[PDB]
């Protein structure tokens, strides 16, 4: 019955989110606005979200992703894909067709159709940054447009990234708005001044 | 019944080994969509396959249990078509690497290993999830 919380929780490991320095172009498939805490992207294309951490979590930690609607009147409704894209044949073999968020390039990905919250989530095991770098990058996929009628119907959503342990207890939480669009650059600068 | 399943494995390995220069001797509607799915997975999950290939230290003395241990972790949270494709691809990946390390005899072992794990663990689920027909209907 309750709605997932969006409250920031850096926790005992200093869990913070990061995104690449991408600008408003036309050949831009993914760009994040620091001013609006909003990421703009197209359907089924790479969305790199890096996990910044001040102290490496222990082994067995998991990184979860969940979408909720931003407006208060729609927070109680599950974020699902539209019927067109659920019946559409774009499954990679690992993601169930109803899920909106996916993770590409990770064989250990798992998708949860929660039998009590009815809410979809994607979880991968946490791994410390690669040698030479300083953050863990996860590539997400949004398989439905924000404009997509019958699903979101132009309702803006948030993506909640949480750190959790073996049993799913909270270790960290961060969030950011996301819009799925055909032309992100034009749709970003349009909202970057209003 | 199982035999048909041994054909799926050896046909897969003889096809991927053949796109290299290695010739290896031990309808087609399902084998080609499986081989096409595997060629996809070798690019998507090259880091995972390299990690699985490092946990399995493939030597001539490598036993089936060391192979099933890595593959069982692949199906830890349940089996699906995506992870079955990665099962076929990881197997075909290992033979390609063993041929490249002057260990051509290890291919027959990997072929046999994939067959037994297929019949003992994946076959029961394949039959109740629409068979290989359903894998053609989607992928
Ligand atoms: Zn849609």
Contact by Cβ (8 Å): B120, B113: no
| Alpha-carbon B102 to chain mean position | 20
How many Cα neighbours within 13 Å face the side chain of A167?
Answer: 1
Distances B67 to A157, A176, B41, B70, B112 between C-alpha atoms, Å: 43, 41, 19, 6, 11
- Please give the residue of chain A at the shortest CA–CA distance from B79: A94
Q: How far is it, in rounded angstroms, from Cα A174 to Cα A159? A: 8
- Alpha-carbon distance of A7 to A70, in angstroms, equals 13
Structural domain boundaries enclosing B128: 1-139
Mutation pick from A107, A108, A121, A124 vs chain B, by most beta carbons of B within 10 Å, is A107
Alpha-carbon distance of A17 to B135, in angstroms, equals 38
Measured between alpha carbons, how far is A101 from A132 in angstroms, rounded to an integer? 29
- Residue contact B85–A107, C-beta within 8 A: no
Cα–Cα dist A145/A143, whole Å: 7
3-state secondary structure chain A: CCCCCCCCECHHHCCEEECCCCCCCCCCCEEEECCCCEEEECCCCCEEEEEECCCCCCCCCEEEEEEEECCHHHCCCCCCCCHHHHHCCCCCCCCCCCCCEEECCCCCCEEEECCCCCCEEEEEECCCCCCCCCCEEEEEEECCCCCCCCCCCCCCEEEEEEEECCCCCEEEEEEEEEEECCCHHHHHHHHCCC
A144 is in an annotated binding site: yes
Residues 6+ apart with CB under 8 A from A44: A90, A141, A142, A143
Experimental technique of record? X-ray
How close A130 gets to chain B, by Cα (Å)?
Answer: 12
Cα A88 to Cα A102, A186, B139, distances in angstroms: 15, 27, 12
CA A53 – CA A172 distance, rounded (Å)? 10
Q: Phi/psi of residue A130, each to 5°? A: -60, 155
DSSP secondary structure letters along B6-56: HHHHHHHHHHHHHHTT------HHHHHHHHHHHHHHHHHTHHHHHHHHHHS
Closest to A60 measured CA to CA, from A114, A16, A113, A123: A123
Instruction: Count CB atoms within 10 A of the CB of residue B86.
Output: 27
Residues found in chain B = 139
Distance separating alpha carbons of residues A54 and B79, to the nearest angstrom: 36
In the numeric block, the tokens 């099933």 are attached to B68
A16-18 β-sheet, strand order:
A16-18, A47-52, A136-142, A101-103
For chain A, what's the residue count?
194
Calculate how far, in angstroms, residue A157's C-alpha sits from the geometric centre of ligand 1.
Answer: 14
CB B66 within 8 A of CB A127: no
- A39 with A30: CB under 8 angstroms? yes
Of B74, B77, B138, the CB nearest to A89: B138
**CA-to-CA distance for B113 and B66, rounded, in angstroms?**
10
Sole residue written with tokens 């030597």: B59
Gap from CA of A46 to ligand 1 centroid (Å):
17
Q: Residue A168 CA to chain centroid, in angstroms?
A: 18
Q: Quick one: tokens of A16?
A: 């913070």
Of residues A108, A148, A107, A101, the one with CA closest to residue A122: A101
Which residues does A175 contact at the CB level (< 8 Å), separation at least 6?
A6, A8, A37, A158, A159, A160, A161
Q: Report whether A88 belongs to an annotated binding site.
A: no
Domain boundaries, chain A: 1-194
DSSP 3-state of B77: coil
Spell out which residues of chain A touch residue B81, defining contact as CB-CB under 8 Å.
Answer: 93
**Radius of gyration of the CA atoms of chain A, in A:** 16
* Count of domains observed in chain B: 1
Q: Return the bridge partners of A110, or none.
A: A123
Q: CB of B87 within 8 A of CB of B119?
A: no
| Among the listed residues A158, A185, A161, the one whose alpha carbon sits nearest the alpha carbon of residue A174 | A161
**CB distance A100 to A142 below 8 Å:** yes
Q: Are residues B45 and A91, on separate chains, in Cβ contact within 8 Å?
A: no
Residue A41 annotated as lining a ligand binding site: no
The reply to whether A192 touches chain B by the CB within 8 Å rule is: no
Whether residue A85 is annotated as binding a ligand: the answer is: yes
Pairs of CB atoms within 8 A across A/B: 29
CA angle B26, B28, B34 (to 5 degrees): 80
Quote the CA–CA distance of B36 and B139 in Å, as a whole number: 9
Pairwise CA distance, residues B127 & B109, whole Å: 26
Instruction: Give the residue from A91, A68, A86 showing the smallest Cα distance to A161.
Output: A68
Neighbour-count burial for B102-117, b at 16+ CB within 10 Å, e otherwise: eeeebbebbbbbbbbb
Is there a contact between B92 and B100 (Cβ–Cβ < 8 Å)?
A: no
């Amino acid at each position: 019955s309750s709605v997932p919380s969006q409250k920031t929780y850096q926790g005992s490991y200093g869990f913070r989110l990061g995104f690449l320095h991408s600008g408003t172009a036309k050949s831009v498939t993914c760009t994040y606005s620091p001013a609006l805490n909003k990421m703009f992207c197209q359907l089924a294309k790479t969305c790199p979200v890096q996990l910044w951490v001040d102290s490496t979590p222990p082994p067995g930690t998991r990184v979860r992703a969940m979408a909720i609607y931003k407006q208060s009147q729609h927070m109680t409704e599950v974020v699902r894909r539209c019927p067109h894209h659920e019946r559409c044949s774009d499954s990679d073999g690992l993601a169930p067709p109803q899920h909106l968020i996916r993770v590409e390039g990770n064989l250990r990905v798992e998708y949860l159709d929660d039998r009590n919250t009815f809410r979809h989530s994607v979880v991968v095991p946490y791994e410390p940054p690669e040698v030479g770098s300083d953050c863990t990058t996860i590539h997400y996929n949004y398989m439905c447009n924000s404009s997509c009628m019958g699903g979101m119907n132009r309702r803006p959503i948030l993506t909640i990234i949480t750190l959790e342990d073996s049993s799913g207890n909270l270790l960290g939480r961060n969030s950011f708005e996301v819009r799925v669009c055909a032309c992100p650059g034009r749709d970003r600068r349009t909202e970057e001044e209003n | 019944p199982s035999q048909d399943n041994r054909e799926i494995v050896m046909k897969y390995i003889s096809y991927k080994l053949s796109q290299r220069g290695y010739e290896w001797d031990a309808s087609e509607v399902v084998h080609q969509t499986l081989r096409q799915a595997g060629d996809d997975f070798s690019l998507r999950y090259r880091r995972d396959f390299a990690e699985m290939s490092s946990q399995l230290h493939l030597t001539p003395g490598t036993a089936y249990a060391s192979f099933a241990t890595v593959v069982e972790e692949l199906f830890r949270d349940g089996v699906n078509w995506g992870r079955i494709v990665a099962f076929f691809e990881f197997g075909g990946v290992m033979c390609v690497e063993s041929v490249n390390r002057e260990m051509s005899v290890l291919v027959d072992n990997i072929a046999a290993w994939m067959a037994t794990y297929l019949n003992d663990h994946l076959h029961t689920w394949i039959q109740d999830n629409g068979g290989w027909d359903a894998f053609v209907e989607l992928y």
